[PDB]
């Protein structure tokens, strides 16, 4: 019921069209089964004149009816084809829209292929219910109502005998349908987990071939595929087990009216002909009722598919407070007041984190491998909301300013250099879409990026592969820095941006990058200590604790953790 009223509730703005769908199909329903009756009416009149006389008069009506039925059947499909694809488009858009509001944590823990299956497979699974299936539903009930009226006008008592076995046929259907929903739901989630393994291997197939884990990855696929095969057989049987099983239920009715009506014909209650004609009208009653029951199993099949879609359409979103305020005149006043945060919630990452940064200051942060330097960055990004503490940007709190207006003047380059499938020009256009070629070209030359862009076979309009694998790790990092500077942010963060890039190229950018850094609040995180000594305020973090704070020369003379890192270089 939960997804039944939910999925079928998407047809609500198109209710006015659905009434017309019902009207156009009813005409095709009252003329479709009337075809052998239409021929018999003509012959009954032209039984005496044999040929001609009134025969050419009846042929003119017969031809116009079949021409009308063919014109309306195409008309029924055309109006429904657009209506069906609109619901399919709606659920697919709704799935995508929710993902952008849903927190980062979800993406890091759920499989990437699982969402892919939810977008394509799960939406292509509900594509069958939206189409001819809805048309046959309206066609079924009218043929059922059209048969029950013909039934009672011929036989009254015997029509009740055929209707008495109807709730028993529904009773068994309710058991089969529930079992079909029980199996198709499991079929999809297993496929969802299996689809994730496909994306997992494609993104990093080099690692699999090198360690000879190709056999282990094959049996990893086989272990889920065998569970998919075993549950898939049982799901496909239940999907089509109701139609042949209903034949035995129908055959009971054929034997029932032959006995119950046979008892009347013997005692001379109702003539043998009253039962001999009733068998033909009982066939036009059973056929649509079983068709509706078979198409009740298929809706339950789609109900299981729709159930997997609403699982994400019910998942929490990053919401802005109703008293939201847009940040006017951004300068970059970073403020921290005793911040304590836990990433995994099992082990605390950060303990007592506090610092005040003036607008347009150069700030450096360095320490050991796996301390909590990158964690502070994403807290400022508001990817993971503060557990205990206070963070204020430009005098106003992080929670008070809306997520879009807060991130408006924030720029970041990640450890995992991420590149889109789009062109180099469009990738660099991120942040500032209204940036001319003059701004794109000049920025590349300043940070040693243009050197390899012109070297490409296409140039600036070159297509980028999976995570931009067409260029080396160092070249990829340089493009991200250009992308970050092009957006023109007041607050700038460069997380390991100069790790893959060589020390020789780094010196050529060192001064040019610092010349663009002026008038902007900057926070840089990198292990290369001989490139972060230009920073005004330097903070040292170890095991998620602030041990040292102050100028570069002050850290050297004090002889601590900063001194231990600097000396260990050579």
């Amino acid at each position: 019921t939960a997804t039944l009223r939910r999925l079928l509730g998407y047809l609500r703005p198109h209710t006015f069209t659905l009434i017309m769908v019902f009207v156009f199909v009813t005409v095709s329903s009252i003329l479709g089964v009337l075809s052998p009756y239409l021929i018999g009416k003509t012959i009954a009149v032209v039984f005496v004149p044999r040929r001609f006389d009134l025969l050419p008069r009846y042929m003119l009506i017969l031809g116009t009816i079949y021409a009308l039925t063919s014109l309306l059947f195409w008309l029924q499909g055309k109006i429904m084809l657009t209506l069906s694809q609109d619901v399919v488009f709606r659920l697919r858009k709704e799935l995508f829209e929710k993902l952008q509001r849903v927190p980062v944590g979800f993406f890091d823990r759920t499989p990437h292929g699982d969402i892919i299956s939810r977008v394509i497979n799960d939406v292509d699974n509900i594509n069958n219910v939206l189409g001819n299936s809805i048309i046959q539903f309206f066609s079924g009930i009218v043929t059922l109502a059209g048969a029950v009226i013909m039934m009672f006008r011929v036989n009254v008592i015997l029509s009740l005998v055929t209707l008495s076995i109807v709730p028993l046929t529904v009773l068994i259907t309710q058991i089969v349908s529930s079992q079909t929903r029980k199996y198709f739901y499991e079929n999809q989630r297993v496929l969802g987990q299996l689809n994730g393994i496909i994306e997992e291997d494609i993104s990093g197939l080099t690692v699999i071939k090198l360690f000879t884990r190709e056999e282990k990855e094959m049996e990893k696929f086989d272990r889920v595929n065998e569970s998919l095969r075993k549950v898939g057989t049982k799901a496909q049987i239940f999907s089509g087990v109701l139609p042949p099983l209903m034949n035995m239920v129908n055959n009971l009715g054929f034997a029932l009216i032959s006995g119950f009506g046979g008892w009347l014909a013997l005692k001379d209650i109702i003539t043998v002909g009253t039962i001999a004609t009733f068998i033909g009208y009982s066939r036009q009653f059973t056929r649509p009722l079983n068709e509706l029951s078979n198409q009740f199993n298929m809706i339950q099949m789609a109900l299981a598919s729709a159930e997997r879609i609403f699982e994400i359409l019910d998942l929490e979103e990053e919401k802005d407070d109703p008293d939201a305020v847009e940040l006017r005149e951004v300068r970059g006043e970073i403020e921290f007041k005793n911040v304590w945060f836990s990433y995994d919630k099992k082990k605390p990452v950060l303990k007592d984190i506090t610092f005040h940064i003036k607008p347009g200051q150069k700030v450096a942060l360095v320490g050991p491998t796996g301390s909590g330097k990158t964690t502070i960055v994403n807290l400022l990004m508001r990817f993971y909301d503060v557990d205990r503490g206070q963070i204020l940007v430009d005098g106003i709190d992080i929670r008070k300013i809306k997520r879009s207006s807060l991130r408006s003047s924030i720029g970041i380059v990640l450890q995992d250099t991420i590149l889109f499938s789009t062109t180099v020009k469009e990738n660099l256009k991120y942040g500032n879409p209204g940036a001319t070629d003059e701004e794109i070209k000049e920025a590349a030359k300043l940070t040693h990026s243009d050197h390899f862009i012109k070297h490409l076979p296409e140039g600036y309009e070159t297509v980028l592969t999976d995570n931009g694998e067409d260029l080396s790790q160092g070249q990829r990092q340089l493009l991200a820095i250009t992308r970050a500077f092009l957006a023109n942010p007041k607050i700038l963060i460069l997380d390991a941006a100069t790790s893959n890039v060589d020390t020789k190229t780094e010196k050529s950018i060192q001064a040019a990058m610092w010349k663009l850094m002026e008038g902007k609040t900057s926070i840089i995180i990198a292990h290369r200590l001989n490139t972060i000594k230009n920073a005004d305020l330097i903070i040292v973090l170890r095991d998620g604790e602030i041990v040292e704070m102050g100028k570069h020369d002050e850290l050297i003379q004090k002889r601590g953790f900063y001194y231990e890192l600097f000396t260990s270089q050579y």
Partner: nanobody, 129 residues
Framework: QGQLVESGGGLVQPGGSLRLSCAAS????????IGWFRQAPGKEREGVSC????????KYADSVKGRFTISRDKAKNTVYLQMNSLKPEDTGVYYC??????????????????????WGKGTPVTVSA
Amino acid sequence: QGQLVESGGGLVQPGGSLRLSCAASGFTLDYYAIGWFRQAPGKEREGVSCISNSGGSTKYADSVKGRFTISRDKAKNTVYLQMNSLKPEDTGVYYCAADRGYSEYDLPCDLVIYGMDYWGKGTPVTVSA
């Protein structure tokens, strides 16, 4: 459902002290962070003291220093806040905090909360002559 219950105090002339308990239903004082808040009607929403974990955490307010005595129950799950010698400075609807704790850290003091604003229901104890 995760909700808090706040009760205690009536109408006392400035000088006395009132017992105010923040009873938690479906929440234990052994881990979660629950703290009282000095909230005025139509004005700003300040805090009292945010105490968490079974081990215990010492905390008090800055406006009225060392006068909001706190105590925690391990079995009853209640936080008693006895305002030692009341003043008409702090009058209005007081609130408690739900989730955003897990263990023990520092709490200085205001919490996030996505639901409405703060969970516990405001009890008005006006201490004016």
